[PDB]
Every structure is written in structure tokens, then in C-alpha cells.
């Protein structure tokens, strides 16, 4: 009559407990999962997930997309903290190039390695 | 010169010592906040590793 | 740096990109799913 649902994100847990029915917005259409559903991996749309707990309680968490992994004795929702997308995904990458505004790149030879490393090794020892 | 300048240096260094003593406990407090955030993010990564293992095999 | 204990921080280098009787009901194609999950995995390791 119930399964262990765990809604989690890369930063922290969103929900963990026992549920009677889980309603999700899948990439290919809405789903309604109940105990004993067959193994299923799925991509989730950005929207609210409705859960039903034994009995009548209805959790409605808003999620920005993710992956739903289902097994007959466990339901895992791997949510995302932000709404991924081709413009947002590319813009942050371009902004990380732009932020590295380096007038002179150099060569990378860095032959001063020992002169800098040993100076700081001796200086850091004297302080403690 | 004399005793007056030394007494001023002692008070100055003493005022600085009081805050570095407080900043140690503040760093320990923030260390515990960071350690709880390290544990909170583990379930998501281990489960994604478990899915990719089967989904590739 | 890795947290060995409250008195020891260890500098480290960790490899990111180069990593049983049933099968899943893959809603989109399994290739499309593998491409997205590997990206989420690497980002999560960097965040950790």
C-alpha cells in the first residue's frame, strides 16, 4: 500500500517518507505511480510533483526538472535546483570565458616554481 | 622614549588578540555548517552513479 | 582539499570525465538519458 519516495537535489533533500501515489510531469506525458510499479527511468519537466501519503495528505513540491527513477520497492526523484536550457546552459559557459579577461595569456613554462614554492614552505613553517 | 609608548603598544596588541580568539570559534561554527552541507548532497550523487552503471552495462 | 579530520586538510586531484536481472522502461531513448545523467554527475562532483 506504500513505497519509500525520496525527492533529492544536488544540494539537499526535499522530501523523504512513505507515499501511496506519486504524480509526475514526464518529458513524454504525465505519470501516476503507485506501489509495485515496474522499473522506470524518466526525464521530468519543470513543474509541481503531487504526492499522496497514507491517507488524504497531498504534498505539492515545485521542481525545476530532473530524473525520476522507479523500482517496485523504491521511488527516487533526482531534481534540479535551476531550469536547465540551451540558452542558459550556453550563456553561463560564455560568461565563464568572458570572466577570464586575461590581457596577456603567457606560455605556462612557469620556471619560477621552486623559487616560489620553497619561499612559502619556509615562511609557512615559521608562523606555527 | 619611555613607559608611555610601550603601554600603548600593549593595549593595541591586546585589543587584536581578543578578536582573533573570537574568530577561531566563529571559524569552528562555520566549519560545522559546511560539514552538514557536505553530507546533505551525497544521496543525489550516489544514486546518479547507481543509474549510469546499469544504464551503460 | 579533502577533509581528513578537523585538524588535517589534504590537497588532492580527482578524475572527473573518464569514469542485474531486469531492465528499465526508458521513456525517451536510453542514449538521450545517458547524455544528461553524465553531465549532472560531473557537475555534482564539482559542487561536492
CA C28 to chain centre: 21
- The upper half-sphere exposure of residue A71, i.e. CA atoms within 13 Å in the direction of its Cβ, equals 13
How many degrees, rounded to 5, is the angle at CA B13 between CA B7 and CA B16? 145
Looking from the CA of A48 toward its CB, the CA atoms found within 13 Å total 6
Chains with 3 or more CB pairs closer than 8 angstroms to C? A, B
Residues in chain C with CB shorter than 8 Å from the CB of A73 are: none
The experimental technique used to determine this model is cryo-EM
From the list A42, A39, A41, the residue with the least C-alpha distance to A72 is: A39
Subunits next to A (3 or more Cβ pairs <8 Å) are: B, C
Contact in structure between A43 and A79 (CB atoms under 8 Å)? no
- Helix (H) and strand (E) counts for chain C? 1, 2
Q: Do C27 and A39 touch (CB under 8 A)?
A: no
What is the Cα–Cα distance from A77 to B37, expressed in whole angstroms?
A: 19
Resolution to one decimal, Å: 2.8
Cβ–Cβ under 8 Å, residues A8 and A78: yes
Contact between chains at B35 and C3 (C-beta distance less than 8 A)? yes
Q: How far apart are CA A75 and CA A59, in angstroms?
A: 15
CA angle B25/B27/B28 to nearest 5° reads: 60
In this complex, do C26 and A41 lie within 8 Å of one another by their Cβ atoms? yes
Residues of C in contact with A27 (CB under 8 A): 27-28
d(CA B41, CA A11): 5
Interface of C with A (CB under 8 A): 22-28, 32-33, 36-37, 40, 43-44, 47
Nearest-CA neighbor of A40 among A19, A65, A69? A69
Amino acid at each position: 500500500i506504500t513505497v519509500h519516495c525520496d525527492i533529492v537535489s544536488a544540494e539537499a533533500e526535499i522530501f523523504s517518507g512513505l507515499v501511496e501515489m506519486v504524480i509526475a510531469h514526464g518529458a513524454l506525458g504525465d505519470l501516476g505511480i503507485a506501489p509495485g510499479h515496474a522499473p522506470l527511468i524518466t526525464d521530468l519537466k519543470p513543474g509541481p510533483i503531487r504526492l499522496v501519503k497514507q491517507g488524504g495528505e497531498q504534498e505539492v513540491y515545485y521542481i525545476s526538472g530532473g530524473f525520476l527513477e522507479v523500482q517496485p520497492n523504491m521511488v527516487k526523484v533526482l531534481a534540479d535546483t535551476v531550469v536547465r536550457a540551451g540558452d542558459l546552459d550556453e550563456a553561463a559557459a560564455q560568461e565563464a570565458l568572458k570572466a577570464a579577461e586575461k590581457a596577456l595569456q603567457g606560455k605556462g613554462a612557469e620556471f619560477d616554481y621552486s623559487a616560489a614554492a620553497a619561499r612559502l614552505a619556509e615562511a609557512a613553517a615559521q608562523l606555527r | 622614549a619611555g613607559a608611555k609608548e610601550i603601554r600603548s603598544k600593549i593595549a593595541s596588541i591586546k585589543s587584536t588578540q581578543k578578536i582573533t580568539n573570537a574568530m577561531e570559534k566563529v571559524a569552528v561554527s562555520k566549519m560545522r555548517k559546511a560539514q552538514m552541507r557536505m553530507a546533505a548532497g551525497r544521496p543525489y550523487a550516489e544514486r546518479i552513479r547507481q543509474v549510469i552503471g546499469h544504464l551503460a552495462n | 582539499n579533502k577533509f581528513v579530520n578537523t585538524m588535517t586538510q589534504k590537497p588532492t586531484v580527482e578524475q572527473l570525465i573518464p569514469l542485474h536481472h531486469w531492465d528499465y522502461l526508458y521513456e525517451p531513448d536510453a542514449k538521450s538519458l545517458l547524455d544528461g545523467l553524465l553531465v549532472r554527475y560531473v557537475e555534482s562532483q564539482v559542487y561536492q
